Homo-oligomer: A and B are copies of this chain.
Amino acid sequence: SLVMSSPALPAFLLCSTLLVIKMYVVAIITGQVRLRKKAFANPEDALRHGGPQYCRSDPDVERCLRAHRNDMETIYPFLFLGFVYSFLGPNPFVAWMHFLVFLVGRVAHTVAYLGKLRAPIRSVTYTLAQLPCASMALQILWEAARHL
Contact = CB atoms under 8 A, between A and B. Distances in A.
Nearest to A113: B42
Interface residues of A, number: 57
Contacts of A145: 10, 14
Contacts of A47: 119
Chain multiplicity (copies) = 3
Contact of A44 (B10, B11, B41, B119): B119
8 smallest beta-carbon distances between A and B, as pairs? A48-B119, A13-B144, A10-B147, A14-B144, A2-B87, A3-B147, A17-B140, A44-B119
A61 interface: no
Given A20-B77, A76-B72, A130-B24, A44 B118 contact: yes
Interface of A: 1-4, 6, 9-11, 13-14, 16-18, 20-21, 23-24, 27, 41-42, 44-45, 47-49, 63, 66, 68, 72-73, 76-77, 79-81, 84, 87-89, 116-120, 122-123, 130, 133-134, 137, 140-141, 143-145, 147-148
**A interface: dominant SS:** helix
